[PDB]
Amino acid sequence: HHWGYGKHNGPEHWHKDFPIAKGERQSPVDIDTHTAKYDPSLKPLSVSYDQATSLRILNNGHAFNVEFDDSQDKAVLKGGPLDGTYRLIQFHFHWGSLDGQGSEHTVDKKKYAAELHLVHWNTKYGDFGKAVQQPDGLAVLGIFLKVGSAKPGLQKVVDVLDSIKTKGKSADFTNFDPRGLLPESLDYWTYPGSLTTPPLLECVTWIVLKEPISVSSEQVLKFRKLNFNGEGEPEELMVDNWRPAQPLKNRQIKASFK
Ligand SMILES: [Cl-]
Ligand SMILES: [Cu+2]
Ligand SMILES: [Hg+2]
Ligand SMILES: [Zn+2]
């Protein structure tokens, strides 16, 4: 039975099909702010999304993915802990059934209402499938969401969700500008980890921003109206699609800021 987030197929079961779930550099993790070390050898981070080309939005039965044209260097992440250039391929979120949970990373055990992952692949490996065979194939920019004022740059996503309610549905999603999902500050923590959904591949340099974005209660409420199930199946609301914190093991979390 497919992986998911319910009691019978959720994160505590993933290891049986994906034994790497219990591996040496799994994500997410708790970010203990008092033991992360400021690292002065970190170059500033460069987020260049002005030429981004969004194509489509898809409900895949686990979350929704906003997919980008990554066939040219258009929306790239560089600098910070990264060597070379990473190309944006998609973003998605993880969120809760209530505002007190939903993030995957936690900050001194604090859970945010949701978390945005902008997924990029290392353009020295030619494309995504080859990048995910490399320990430095991916960079994911992770951004916490808290409930407060609306985030204007998220509204076009929220408005399209009605049209991709159930698993397998997709809609045209061109000209979406991901710059409108960023907070003001680019201060971040970074550590080596993995994708947080099966197949949980240990390819990711995580860059998790310290500053959350605020979204309104009405915006997150619309995320919670999505469905894990497909059309004409019984309703299973898409909520709590987050994996909990995993063992830090032999890893150090570095901070970009004092
Ligand atoms: Cl690898
Ligand atoms: Cu699936
Ligand atoms: Hg890998
Ligand atoms: Zn994710």
Swiss-Prot record:
Changing residue 60 to L: Reduced activity. The record marks 5, 60, 65 as: Fine-tunes the proton-transfer properties of H-64. Keywords: Acetylation, Cell membrane, Cytoplasm, Disease variant, Lyase, Membrane, Metal-binding, Osteopetrosis, Phosphoprotein, Zinc. It catalyses: hydrogencarbonate + H(+) = CO2 + H2O; urea = cyanamide + H2O. Signal peptide: none annotated. Changing residue 104 to D: Normal CO(2) hydrase activity. Its cofactor is Zn(2+); Co(2+). Changing residue 115 to Q: Strongly reduced activity and sulfonamide affinity. Changing residue 65 to H: Enhanced proton transfer. Changing residue 60 to A: Reduced activity. Zn(2+) binds at residues 92, 94, 117. PROSITE patterns: ALPHA_CA_1, ALPHA_CA_2. SUPFAM superfamilies: Carbonic anhydrase. One of its GO terms (biological process) is positive regulation of cellular pH reduction. One of its GO terms (molecular function) is zinc ion binding. One of its GO terms (cellular component) is plasma membrane. CDD domains: alpha_CA_I_II_III_XIII. Changing residue 63 to F: Reduced activity. Changing residue 142 to R: In OPTB3; complete loss of activity. The record marks 90 as: Involved in the binding of some activators, including histamine and L-histidine. Target of drugs used in treatments against glaucoma disorder and breast cancer. Belongs to the alpha-carbonic anhydrase family. Catalyzes the reversible hydration of carbon dioxide. Can also hydrate cyanamide to urea. Stimulates the chloride-bicarbonate exchange activity of SLC26A6. Essential for bone resorption and osteoclast differentiation. Involved in the regulation of fluid secretion into the anterior chamber of the eye. Contributes to intracellular pH regulation in the duodenal upper villous epithelium during proton-coupled peptide absorption. Interacts with SLC4A4. Interaction with SLC4A7 regulates SLC4A7 transporter activity. Interacts with SLC26A6 isoform 4 (via C-terminus cytoplasmic domain). It is linked to Osteopetrosis, autosomal recessive 3: A rare genetic disease characterized by abnormally dense bone, due to defective resorption of immature bone. Osteopetrosis occurs in two forms: a severe autosomal recessive form occurring in utero, infancy, or childhood, and a benign autosomal dominant form occurring in adolescence or adulthood. Recessive osteopetrosis commonly manifests in early infancy with macrocephaly, feeding difficulties, evolving blindness and deafness, bone marrow failure, severe anemia, and hepatosplenomegaly. This is Carbonic anhydrase 2. The lineage of its organism: Eukaryota, Metazoa, Chordata, Craniata, Vertebrata.
